[PDB]
Amino acid sequence: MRSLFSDHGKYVESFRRFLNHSTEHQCMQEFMDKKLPGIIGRIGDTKSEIKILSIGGGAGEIDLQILSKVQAQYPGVCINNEVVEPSAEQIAKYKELVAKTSNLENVKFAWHKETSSEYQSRMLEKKELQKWDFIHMIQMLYYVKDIPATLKFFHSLLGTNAKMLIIVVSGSSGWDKLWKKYGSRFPQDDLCQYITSDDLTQMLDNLGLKYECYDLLSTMDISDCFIDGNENGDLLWDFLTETXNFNATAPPDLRAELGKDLQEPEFSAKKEGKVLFNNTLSFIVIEA
Ligand SMILES: CCN(CC)Cc1cc(Nc2ccnc3cc(Cl)ccc23)ccc1O
């Protein structure tokens, strides 16, 4: 088999179906509306500029919502939103989104086509480290080589009253169960780390950083995954397994097995007929 990250083709397409078959964005949006305002309430205090660093910003749809909340707390204040993203493709999409979005006059965007790691190296050379008021790393620590070094470095970039938000799947999610029970069944992955909020809180504890973690239930409708002849299902199987052509490249044993307990209370829930895989998310807020 081959990590999904490989075939850029389906990698991007399996994710598309994921969002259309999950509550991932609704969950995040819920967090931005109910919890974020309170979290960023003082990051702009005494500042004539608010610096926001988006690590791993994809097309920026969540980025803009966060910006929305920031502007709401600090009307009139210029916002400098820098985005660190290696994909020239995501950057292009992010830009087009920004161009079609109204009420962004007060915001200056900057895109850095590189990984958080490269960004780190480049900054460490500079005469001095620049501070940020808000840094967010949404669903991307999975693709980082050195997580503790990333957490420690970006936390060191936090200014006075600054905050750092991290989002990854929760340790109580179905992903955690899925990775513990079938982890061995798959080959080593130099392109992806299968970590959850449990791994993060452990690293944060040892790092001695102050943080708070909130969990919000989220679901992934994996119904189509149980219909042999279904294009969408097969795509969901790739995402769910972080594997290129899973059904086609995976031992019938692993396949038949997974498709069995993927319907167990252990991994999913059955409501309205649908099979809802546990996609519970964790929102981690770190203080300067
Ligand atoms: C390695 C693990 N899986 C899930 C636990 C994590 C994971 C990755 C993502 N991000 C993505 C996965 C696959 N293709 C993608 C393609 C694009 Cl253009 C942007 C983000 C992607 C989103 C949610 C999520 O939970």
UniProtKB/Swiss-Prot annotation:
- Binding site residues for S-adenosyl-L-methionine: 56, 85, 90, 116, 138
Q: Where is it mostly found?
A: cytoplasm
GO CC terms of this entry: centrosome; cytoplasm; cytosol; extracellular exosome; nucleoplasm
Any Gene Ontology biological process: methylation
Enzyme Commission designation: 2.1.1.8
Q: Which domain of life is it from?
A: Eukaryota
Q: Name one Pfam family in it.
A: Methyltransf_23
User: Which reaction equation describes what this protein catalyses?
Assistant: histamine + S-adenosyl-L-methionine = N(tau)-methylhistamine + S-adenosyl-L-homocysteine + H(+)
Q: Which residues bind substrate?
A: 24, 279
The record's annotation in InterPro entries points to: HHMT-like, SAM-dependent_MTases_sf
| GO MF entries | histamine N-methyltransferase activity
Signal peptide bounds: none
Keyword Transferase in annotation? yes
Family that this chain belongs to: Belongs to the class I-like SAM-binding methyltransferase superfamily. HNMT family.
What's its job?
Answer: Inactivates histamine by N-methylation. Plays an important role in degrading histamine and in regulating the airway response to histamine.
Its subunit composition reads: Monomer.
What illness does the record link it to?
Answer: Intellectual developmental disorder, autosomal recessive 51: A disorder characterized by significantly below average general intellectual functioning associated with impairments in adaptive behavior and manifested during the developmental period.
Tell me the protein's name. Histamine N-methyltransferase
